[PDB]
Structures are given as C-alpha cells and as structure tokens.
C-alpha cells in the first residue's frame, strides 16, 4: 504494498518471487522471499503450510513483473522445502513463521550473481536496528483493499520499526505480538505491506550493511491505524537457519 513506489529488481536483487502451479496447469503468485545464499531462499512457513508439496512451486529471481518476463530472470524448482516444525497460527498472529527453500534450476544449478540477482546478508545474533529505524519492504502484494489482482509491477516502501512496548499496547496487538516478532509501520498509516507481500524481506541498513532484519508475516488489515505490519525477527532464528542449511 500500500502506498510506496513501483520499483525494479535491480533495486531489490535478493527478491524472490514464488508461484504455485495448480491442478489444471494454471500458475498463481503465492509469496515473496529473499535470497540468502546462492542455493537458499528464505520465506514464511504460512505461505506453504496448506500446500506443502514442493513440486508445485516455482521460484523466480531477477524478476520485476508478475506476469511478464524480465531480461536476466532465472527460474528455479524447489529441491527442499523446510517449514518450521513449531509453526502455529492464532486469529491474527503467526508464530515461528519462517521457511527455507533450497532452489535448483533444471540443470541443477543454484543462483548465479548478477546485476539483478544478489544475496542479502543475515543479521548477527540478537542484533537488530533501534526502534525508529527506517527499513524497506518489497513485494507484489495488494495496493488497495479492493484489489482482486496483484499489481503487475514490483513495489517497495519504507516503514519505521516500532518497539515491542508500543506494539503490545492494548489498541495495537496486546500480548498477541511477542519478542520473536518485529513491528513496523508508517507514522501516518499511509503505507504498509499487504496480502501477497508475505514471505518477503524487511531490509534495514545495519553497520552500513543492508541486512535481512525481518520477514513479512502478519497484520490486521493493511495500513490500518494502530495496526502495524508484523515481521518474523530473523535474528532470533539464526540457530534454526544455520542447523537447517
């Protein structure tokens, strides 16, 4: 996404677009993801939990448009789909909402770095930006409530990190938000991630290094007053990421 700007994949080169092939052969967009190493994309478990058959998924890198080709784009199959075993969902909140996709081209190759395909750095253990930090989100999600199709062009926006203390206020999310989550929103509630942006990156500049701080996970509505976007706090899951890769 709501608000923000249209972007191109060269400005977001770690961005992974994940689709699912349906019975009958139609393909639909599922979620975003982030390239963290040449063979590994990180995303959200909630994006796959209802259809956990890895053969059905297609992952694109270097892609700026939803339904047309981008020069330099690479297409991948999923070799291994790793969902978090302690994933659960409440009415609003999603817990341990993190997934790993090992990707492989039909030739058995991983991603080849380029102008439009790059990895994003992971954060260090229990190291996050201070609240109030401006961070970027990217995706093909809804631009407004009334959208019935996702936008054709990739989008990005900038939101500010919100403290756990603020996010757990009773008119925010109360105790439904936990310390393994990060909240972020626009101070004027004019821009946010929305449906279809799940799984995609929340990127902050840490020590001059662009870092994957969060994964789009949940939220009530989109750009709704006092209802931030909620993101999986990547820095908490480093042991899980390290043990599964």
């Amino acid at each position: 996404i709501i608000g923000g700007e249209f972007t191109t994949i060269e400005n977001q080169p770690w961005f992974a677009a994940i689709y699912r092939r349906h019975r009958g052969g139609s393909v639909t967009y599922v979620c975003g993801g982030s390239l963290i190493s040449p063979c590994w994309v990180i995303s959200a478990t909630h994006c796959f939990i209802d259809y956990p058959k890895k053969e059905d998924y297609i992952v694109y890198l270097g892609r700026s448009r939803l339904n047309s080709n981008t020069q330099g784009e690479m297409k991948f199959e999923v070799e291994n789909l790793i969902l978090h075993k302690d994933y659960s969902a409440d009415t609003l909140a999603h817990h341990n909402d993190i997934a790993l996709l090992k990707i492989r081209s039909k030739e058995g190759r991983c991603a080849q770095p380029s102008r439009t395909i790059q990895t994003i750095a992971l954060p260090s253990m229990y190291n996050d930006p201070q609240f109030g930090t401006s961070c970027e989100i990217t995706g093909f999600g809804k631009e407004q409530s009334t959208d019935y199709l996702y936008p054709e062009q990739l989008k990005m926006t900038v939101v500010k990190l919100i403290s756990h203390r603020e996010c757990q206020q009773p008119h925010y999310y109360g105790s439904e938000v936990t310390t393994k989550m990060l909240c972020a929103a626009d101070p004027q509630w004019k821009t946010d991630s929305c449906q279809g942006d799940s799984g995609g990156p929340l990127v902050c500049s840490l020590q001059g290094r662009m870092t994957l701080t969060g994964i789009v996970s949940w939220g009530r509505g989109c750009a709704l007053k006092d209802k931030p976007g909620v993101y999986t706090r990547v820095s908490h899951f480093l042991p899980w990421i390290r043990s599964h890769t």
């Binding site: 599922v30 979620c31 259809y51 929305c194 789009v216 996970s217 939220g219």
Partner: peptide, 13 residues
C-alpha cells in the same frame, strides 16, 4: 474470516 497477511495460499482464505 481468514484474510490478509498470514493467509496467502490457504484453503480458508
């Protein structure tokens, strides 16, 4: 019911 971020690619969506 099950709408928005968290509910992509769900039967309940």
């Amino acid at each position: 019911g099950x709408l928005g971020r968290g509910c992509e690619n769900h039967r309940c969506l």
